[PDB]
Design a binder for this molecule. Structure first.
Ligand SMILES: *[C@@H]1O[C@H](CO)[C@@H](O[C@@H]2O[C@H](CO)[C@@H](O[C@@H]3O[C@H](CO[C@H]4O[C@H](CO)[C@@H](O)[C@H](O)[C@@H]4O)[C@@H](O)[C@H](O[C@H]4O[C@H](CO)[C@@H](O)[C@H](O)[C@@H]4O)[C@@H]3O)[C@H](O)[C@H]2NC(C)=O)[C@H](O)[C@H]1NC(C)=O
Ligand SMILES: *[C@@H]1O[C@H](CO)[C@@H](O[C@@H]2O[C@H](CO)[C@@H](O[C@@H]3O[C@H](CO[C@H]4O[C@H](CO)[C@@H](O)[C@H](O)[C@@H]4O)[C@@H](O)[C@H](O[C@H]4O[C@H](CO)[C@@H](O)[C@H](O)[C@@H]4O)[C@@H]3O)[C@H](O)[C@H]2NC(C)=O)[C@H](O)[C@H]1NC(C)=O
Ligand SMILES: *[C@@H]1O[C@H](CO)[C@@H](O[C@@H]2O[C@H](CO)[C@@H](O)[C@H](O)[C@H]2NC(C)=O)[C@H](O)[C@H]1NC(C)=O
Ligand SMILES: *[C@@H]1O[C@H](CO)[C@@H](O[C@@H]2O[C@H](CO)[C@@H](O)[C@H](O)[C@H]2NC(C)=O)[C@H](O)[C@H]1NC(C)=O
Ligand SMILES: *[C@@H]1O[C@H](CO)[C@@H](O[C@@H]2O[C@H](CO)[C@@H](O)[C@H](O)[C@H]2NC(C)=O)[C@H](O)[C@H]1NC(C)=O
Ligand code: NAG
Ligand code: NAG
Ligand code: NAG
Ligand code: NAG
Ligand code: NAG
Ligand code: NAG
Ligand code: NAG
Ligand code: NAG
Ligand code: NAG
Ligand code: NAG
Ligand code: NAG
Ligand code: NAG
Lengths: 124, 433, 433, 124, 433, 124
């Protein structure tokens, strides 16, 4: 039951500032037929959308951490605004326009910078 | 200062996906086959704040996922019952003596294919075509399409179905009252699945739909067009009452081994017309209020006119009622009136057909069995379907349906399915120490 | 003192789910289509300790998931072979000269639908119905149901299938010996999937079933009822031997283009009855041991009696044997005996039918092709099917089947599917420091 | 293969005391057809039952910990028996009767009390 | 020193799995039904280094997952159009007057099953069989198989499909040039899905296939065998040109209610043969280069010979061209030549059939509608299909196809699907402190 | 998309030494129809192959660690070669021949030796 209800629950305050979505979430979280084939086609997609974001989390050294904090330097060719300009004067939907063309080069960079943590310090 | 990620951020993207049914919880039915998930007793809608999302009505995808699966639903339901292939022979029909209904007498095969009984039935004049008059008819379209009959146990009464998106998707829903059909509306709320949608089938006047809020809405795509239809939503429900007062008597006849069907026997009493009724003062004011909401989008006078003509699926008001398919005239005291500046009753003459070619295609043609006794259905007219003339002074609006997807584009005028992308990336102060 | 969670705790809940097949690993077959997972060579059963779980037999769900998919299995198998629609015409049958078997001669169409050869076949008197005598017959039910024939390559020999629950579910299994059908039993063991279940089809006496352990079990639902049947499980297997000593000769006839079927040609030698055999001393003691286990649940004398009568699917012992469907009398020297306080052989007369209406429904009627040469099948009678008379002195038990789900309710009398809920919540001393 | 065998293996000693199921587990752990659609309908349900309990674990800060220990105070309106009374004089099936009506109010409480751990100490 | 695990290690294992389609992105088509995933615009192949993996060609599984789903594809496409069951009656055919084409005249039923018009069509002599001559023919195989016709909208033009393994599997691909069909090759590269495979249908000479690299490859299974075929891949593409210069006129005839089909009307102008063309100097050198690559594997002289004979699907060169099915002689100036030590043109006579029994089975027999006007298709012969005689001096090679799976075993001669097992276990110094 | 692409990406340098596959990975990681049923049968298998190895990882106390280091002693009846002999003079495909008959007895041993870590040190 709790496989897509949390996905719908993420959309609370979708127009608020980016520095408020980490704050104003706790204020709202206080309280063979034809359809036999449509439901199967729906359930496979519902599983696949969860597993895709799960593998995308699992490659970055955090598999259940919400605010996962990674050791990758911020390349300023992707954005040029400071922390106080982004986090207090933008909504989360508007951020995906500026970051929307450097997604895969950040994803692969995060993957290899997490792979270096396993190679370097642990055993080798 | 360093890249960090965030699980569960409010970021969506418009997409195309596969929805499913949800009924409100035992004879078989073509719409909800008693194979649907039970609905939420209290649906959870999450109202958004201070966000403007623009979405198109005519470029939707749910209205194409609604015209496809309904076709598949009738394909699934009309499969396991008998086709009327060996029925149509050289019929010998004269009239009924109770011109509208003919007394046909033909040679069907009995339970074994070696003897032939002559069996009589009663058909409508709108259902047989002559061959020479000389009174030798045949069934209307057993030359282009194989014809099946409806399995007589199932019903057509539209119970409302809900369309739920899969888990991990969202369905937006506009809550603005005066929402013109295409543009940005600023009161948006997400819902897992929509309200009750009755899958009603009509082509001229919309029936049993949800009314508008506090205004008359004129939904279109290009108002400077001639082929693009004009959906006129309503906020004043006008009641219609359609009935036939004849007491029909069905009769079973056998055409093949294990293959039987039902046809009209004799008619009880004096024959009377099937008619529909519309209150006059509840209709004149409705046309006047639509006329003022159409004058300002053209800045000239408008005048309603009759339909075009031709076949009797375009110049009529076709609808379903209790298991019988009507075809009413709808162009007598409705659409010959202009607009300047007594409890009467308008009666529309209406004719009934047995064999119907639904969704105006070839290869599919169902046959409706007759219904014993009279029927009477009272409904709500919330919505019209107009079409501009093609002139260019004044204005002339032919009332005529463009398709059947436009019949679904009134209950789905405020929904768009999106896919959430809950991964966000932001710079912050922390680093993985 | 603080809430903690636990993964993997022994907590279950009764539920309803979808099971699947598992055969014991090449002609086609209707039961196992050679599309089933291979079984475990050694199944792992986990015996539970010191727990009493109560489960109902008659309120099971696997016995409704067994009557549905078998119907779907015969629906899937009888699809791609020929239907006998153009077969039944005005037949012209007199007798065989080798009253039980008639020599029918009819007009079938040849490979092209312009010539008609008269072709002869041999049918049973229990398979044609007259029309006037005057000797003009027709096939038995080509007026209510379209009739298909069995594809002649497939077989009906019941190989045992195992029902496995999905991963994340459990199937309980009672291990108590004297388990009355409904109540709490205190020796429970979980198993992933059950033992070998032969999907046998019988209606009067159960065949090839698993025996009881060390007692005679009398399973019922309401023993103070009249319509609720009484399943009498057994622990002494009584051997039955059923055969027909006639050497039948099949013969191919063609009825349509690419459409042929097989019918009985001539019969070799002198005609003899098809009969079944039951040893008398192995049956008198079996009825006496059942009679004592039924006297104590009514505290009056019991007396067996004949069946009711009517159609020949209720007052008979219908079963399948080697690809042929028998209908034996079963009420001659079995059910006219009371109970007070030589190596003989009881012979039951038995008649054979070709066209059978299995599962007593309409719309489905398969036709069995004849089998060349004699057949002989030896089986085990582990189980009866009795029914109280409806009086109320003494007692009278009509031997008669109530349904076909009761034929599965002997091999599934000790299984219930549950869903594990491995999340537990308990207070403890630790907190997340 | 090991997707439901462990689910069946959890049912060892289902009648023992609650303080023995954490002990007496190591003593036993020492050593297109019709069926083509039934198997697909079974496999989707087998995946979904595993993913539902996986998300229910993943929302509580432990995604593979067996005895996951959480920082939520025990509200005594749910149960009134002590630790020595519950853990030594009850079986695990009998506990689900007493706790059986406060399940969702504990689940949402665990979710928000885990969300507070990510908000407070890590970055914000 | 202690056990540690590793996620993602290069370890595979040969397995059997279920692949799927991928086309290169609108009339319907039998091969790609416009329901296939779009391909990668640039496929990612990962070349392996310094590894020898041996795989068999004839023991593959993709060539059995290719012969099954193509059968299912034609089963899916030939379902919803009309079967020619009531067509074949006692035909009355004499000749055309424009022996190869007969003018047949028969009695079809009109749109209602009470009148019969005599309608004429034109059939080929290779398509009707006589009954007595006396000139009364019938259709060729409406005695063993029900015959359907092709739905006339769909096409047969082979667009290439790609076979993608599921996520979590790998498809190896050998990159060696001179790869004999079975053995270890040492230049292996993984690819998610293979190159474009045209699903061409031929039985004598391979058409439109991928050429070899820099050599002539002689693929076989047992070269000391007589029934095992010999696939001879090529590296010199020889162009073939096949055409019929007659201007055929199709004609619609109606046989049932809603059931019509198309047949040949009259032929425009003088009748001419359908022939194929092969350049002589591009063929003599090709046979000589194959002959030297076959002499060294037998160490005796080889001599090509004619085909065996019998039915006209084995001793011919059957192929498809533009929606018409050809059957050419292919044994006139190709296979009567030995090998010692002018821009001419070889013309092969070729005959056309309408009714074809593809994949040499019973129960399925499609009918091809005629094509208006002439057709001309130019193709590439990359591959032969030879068979040893069975003697044992010299050698004789009958050119003749063994199956249709061998037609797929040229485009799948270098692919094997494996399943990765990314869990590795190794001892190391660390322990979980 | 990234549900089997990483599975194909694991096969880089499948003929190299075992002590180089942990090194030479960073050098290469720098940069209803018929088919409607085939794709569904493929997607269920693609999900199941990922979840099987995920549960097999999750039972051993590491659910996203790549080089997961466990506290199980090396029984030398499985192999007798030293660390320098195995890791520098063998490929990863050749190791599965020697270890190929002691797989399940290592898997169950790893499971119970991880279960002891939860029982002993944490709470009980
Ligand atoms: C309840 O349980 C009883 C158990 O006895 C079942 O009885 C068996 O029924 C099957 C089905 O009729 C019998 O199997 C058939 O046996 C025929 C004769 O068997 C001879 O050959 C075998 C070879 O090993 C010997 O072992 C045996 O002793 C005989 O010498 C076979 O001919 C059949 O095989 C093939 O026959 C023809 C070809 O001639 C094919 O068309 C068939 O498809 C088939 O492939 C078949 O194997 C079996 O013999 C019976 N057991 C006996 C007599 O002990 C009941 O069927 C079962 N179910 C009920 C009552 O519903
Ligand atoms: C092996 O490989 C060869 C490669 O040559 C294939 O040969 C091709 O076969 C196809 C199928 O017959 C041919 O495609 C058809 O061409 C017709 C004529 O093409 C003219 O128009 C195109 C337009 O771009 C020009 O490029 C071309 O030069 C010609 O001027 C078309 O008419 C067909 O299109 C439509 O035709 C009718 C309408 O008239 C429709 O009913 C059809 O459905 C279709 O939509 C069609 O495109 C192609 O021309 C051939 N290539 C040539 C001659 O070079 C073999 O088919 C292939 N396979 C084997 C042998 O099995
Ligand atoms: C936006 O739409 C929502 C949903 O219709 C409105 O919220 C409702 O407003 C009415 C009247 O004020 C209340 O009776 C309801 O309780 C509200 N909630 C729901 C869930 O229906 C809201 O008022 C609209 N806001 C604007 C600015 O138009
Ligand atoms: C509970 O049922 C189980 C299963 O039948 C019994 O265990 C078997 O007992 C017999 C006889 O003692 C042994 O031969 C078997 O080895 C036992 N195990 C199995 C797996 O069959 C058990 O005895 C029963 N207990 C009670 C109290 O009735
Ligand atoms: C192994 O096969 C690969 C793939 O064909 C070869 O790599 C190609 O070689 C050619 C010619 O040297 C280059 O033009 C290509 O760029 C190479 N790569 C690809 C992806 O095609 C390789 O040369 C072969 N090696 C051996 C030893 O045969
Ligand atoms: C309302 O909008 C303002 C700015 O448009 C925004 O700062 C605020 O967060 C919004 N309200 C809510 C409840 O998000
Ligand atoms: C690509 O990046 C540019 C930044 O140069 C951005 O403006 C644009 O929106 C991006 N996306 C596109 C072109 O889809
Ligand atoms: C119709 O025709 C039948 C015979 O064909 C006749 O018996 C009957 O009286 C006629 N009239 C009506 C009203 O049925
Ligand atoms: C009219 O139809 C009704 C419907 O059931 C029936 O009860 C009645 O007998 C019919 N005849 C008359 C005369 O009312
Ligand atoms: C049955 O009838 C056929 C002709 O209809 C005849 O040839 C045959 O001798 C009869 N008797 C038997 C036993 O077949
Ligand atoms: C009887 O049937 C058997 C079964 O195969 C056959 O072999 C035999 O020839 C038949 N006839 C006689 C006289 O036994
Ligand atoms: C047997 O039952 C007692 C109490 O009923 C319980 O304490 C004990 O744990 C049970 N035995 C086993 C092996 O669980
Ligand atoms: C609900 O809670 C009560 C405690 O007051 C409990 O007795 C009952 O079993 C619970 N469950 C129900 C009513 O299903
Ligand atoms: C074929 O026969 C038809 C009548 O059956 C005739 O009209 C026609 O002239 C004949 N010849 C040709 C070439 O069609
Ligand atoms: C021959 O066929 C072509 C194909 O379309 C057609 O255009 C033409 O009219 C036909 N007749 C002649 C005489 O070319
Ligand atoms: C080439 O092979 C040698 C030994 O066969 C091996 O050491 C080396 O790693 C291989 N090359 C690559 C790039 O893996
Ligand atoms: C089983 O173990 C032996 C070691 O004694 C090994 O040689 C063999 O390859 C293993 N695998 C088998 C027999 O499949």
């Amino acid at each position: 039951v709790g496989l897509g209800a949390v996905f719908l629950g993420f959309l609370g305050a979708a127009g608020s500032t980016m520095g408020a979505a980490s704050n104003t979430l706790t204020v709202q979280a206080r309280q063979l037929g034809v359809w036999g084939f449509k439901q199967l086609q729906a359930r496979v997609l519902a599983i696949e959308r969860y597993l895709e974001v799960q593998q995308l989390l699992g490659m970055w050294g955090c598999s259940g951490k919400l605010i996962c904090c990674t050791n990758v330097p911020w390349n300023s060719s992707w954005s040029n605004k400071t922390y106080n300009e982004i986090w207090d004067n933008m909504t989360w939907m508007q951020w995906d326009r500026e970051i929307g063309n450097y997604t895969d080069t950040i994803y692969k960079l995060l993957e290899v910078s997490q792979f270096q943590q396993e190679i370097n310090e642990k055993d080798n | 200062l360093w890249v960090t990620v965030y699980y569960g951020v409010p970021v969506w993207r418009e997409a195309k996906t596969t929805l499913f049914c949800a009924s409100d919880a035992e004879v078989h039915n073509v719409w909800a086959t008693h194979a649907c998930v039970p609905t939420d007793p209290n649906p959870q809608e999450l109202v958004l704040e201070n966000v403007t999302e623009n979405f198109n009505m005519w470029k939707n995808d749910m209205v194409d996922q609604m015209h496809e699966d309904i076709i598949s639903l009738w394909d699934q339901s009309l499969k396991p019952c008998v086709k009327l292939t060996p029925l149509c022979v050289t019929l010998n029909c004269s009239d009924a003596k109770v011109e509208e209904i003919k007394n046909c007498s033909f040679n069907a095969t009995t339970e074994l294919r070696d003897k032939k009984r002559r069996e009589y039935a009663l058909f409508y004049r709108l259902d047989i075509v002559p061959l020479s008059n000389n009174s030798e008819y045949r069934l209307i379209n057993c030359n282009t399409s194989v014809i099946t009959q409806i399995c007589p146990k199932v019903t057509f009464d539209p119970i409302p179905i809900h369309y739920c998106a899969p888990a991990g998707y969202a369905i937006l829903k506009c809550n603005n009252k005066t929402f013109n059909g295409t543009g940005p509306c600023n009161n948006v709320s997400t819902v897992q699945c929509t309200h009750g949608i009755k899958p009603v089938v009509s082509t001229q006047l919309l029936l049993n739909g949800s009314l508008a809020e506090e205004e008359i809405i004129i939904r279109s795509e290009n108002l400077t067009d001639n082929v693009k239809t004009i959906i006129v939503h309503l906020n004043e429900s006008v009641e219609i009452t359609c009935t036939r007062p004849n007491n029909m008597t069905r009769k079973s006849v056998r055409i093949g081994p294990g293959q039987t069907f039902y046809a009209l026997g004799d008619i009880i009493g004096d024959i009377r017309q099937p008619h529909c009724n519309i209150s006059e003062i509840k209709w004149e004011k409705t046309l006047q209020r639509v006329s003022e909401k159409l004058r300002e989008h053209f800045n000239k006078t408008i005048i309603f006119n009759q339909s075009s003509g031709g076949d009797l699926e375009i110049t009529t008001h076709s609808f379903n009622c209790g298991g019988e398919f009507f075809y009413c005239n709808t162009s007598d005291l409705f659409f010959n009136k202009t607009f300047n500046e007594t409890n009467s009753t308008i009666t529309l003459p209406c004719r009934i057909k047995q064999i119907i070619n639904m969704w105006q295609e070839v290869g599919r043609a169902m046959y409706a069995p007759p219904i014993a006794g009279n029927i009477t259905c009272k409904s709500n007219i919330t919505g019209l379907l107009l079409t501009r003339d093609g002139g260019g002074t004044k204005e002339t609006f032919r009332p005529g349906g463009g398709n059947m997807r436009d019949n679904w584009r009134s209950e789905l005028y405020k929904y768009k399915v999106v896919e959430v992308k809950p991964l966000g990336i932001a710079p912050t102060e922390c680093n993985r120490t």
